[PDB]
Amino acid sequence: RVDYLRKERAALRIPLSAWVEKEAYRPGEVLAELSEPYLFRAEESGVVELKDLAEGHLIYLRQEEEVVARYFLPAGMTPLVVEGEIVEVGQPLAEGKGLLRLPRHMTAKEVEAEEEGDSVHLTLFLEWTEPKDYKVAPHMNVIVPEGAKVQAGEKIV
Amino acid sequence: DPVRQYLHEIGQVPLLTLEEEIDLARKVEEGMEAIKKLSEATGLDQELIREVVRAKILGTAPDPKTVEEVDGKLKSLPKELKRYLHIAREGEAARQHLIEANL
DNA sequence: TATAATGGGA
């Protein structure tokens, strides 16, 4: 079991009316309290990669091998798409229902802010601990000990 | 009856699992390769390091001079090159257990 | 030099 430290910048769009304004975000607090449901729409096209997080989601819209936009779905914003779907510009990807929060195991820092009318365009820097289990066969020997702080590119087994 | 004596002695050593069999055979090959990279770093023969490692493992008791002065030179090496000393030691331990488990 | 083979016998 390797608990990775994953970081990523992702875009978001919500109404200005609901946004609880801050610059640095802690796990679990409220990012917005929506009065009515909101359709969070795609601003680009491509195929969606839906990675389910602890209590959040991340939409990856990609054309060819590159990425066109990184999308962040906070808690209380249920996705409207499925892993491996075609979407285009203007099609909603998630519906913000209720009051949306940061996931309990994720931290958001370096938030941007772009107000256009009642809509605000946020691009925040997320960090969270994503475990991943690994199977090792008899023809494999483990190199690192228990609790070994490891870095990317290093051989584990 | 010396045959019943020896069969009982090899009886104490349990058989080794396929995982242990791969692991011991791995440490053996790693130790043998650790010896060759010590013959490049220090510059002396393979069989010399081979016996000095065998000595310091399977038994305590030229014993005070040549054996200990070669081990002393090996002990006075950088950290990056003393890895292969430890790897050779446990590799020779693996050879012992690999033999004992298949008697 | 390589399938795998693992506690005797009167």
Swiss-Prot record, chain A:
Coiled-coil intervals: none
Subunit-level organization: The RNAP catalytic core consists of 2 alpha, 1 beta, 1 beta' and 1 omega subunit. When a sigma factor is associated with the core the holoenzyme is formed, which can initiate transcription.
Family, per entry: Belongs to the RNA polymerase beta' chain family.
Record function comment: DNA-dependent RNA polymerase catalyzes the transcription of DNA into RNA using the four ribonucleoside triphosphates as substrates.
Protein name, per record: DNA-directed RNA polymerase subunit beta'
The organism's taxonomic lineage, starting at the top: Bacteria, Thermotogati, Deinococcota, Deinococci, Thermales
Swiss-Prot record, chain B:
Annotated stretches, region: Sigma-70 factor domain-1: 1-35
Subcellular location: Cytoplasm
Coiled-coil features, chain-numbered ranges: none
Family membership: Belongs to the sigma-70 factor family. RpoD/SigA subfamily.
Quaternary structure and interacting proteins, as annotated: Interacts transiently with the RNA polymerase catalytic core formed by RpoA, RpoB, RpoC and RpoZ (2 alpha, 1 beta, 1 beta' and 1 omega subunit) to form the RNA polymerase holoenzyme that can initiate transcription.
Domain notes: Contains 4 domains, connected by flexible linkers. In the active conformation, the domains are in an extended conformation, each making extensive interactions with the RNA polymerase catalytic core.
Summary of the function given for this chain in its UniProt record: Sigma factors are initiation factors that promote the attachment of RNA polymerase to specific initiation sites and are then released. This sigma factor is the primary sigma factor during exponential growth.
Descriptive protein name: RNA polymerase sigma factor SigA
Part of the whole protein covered: 94 to 207 of 438
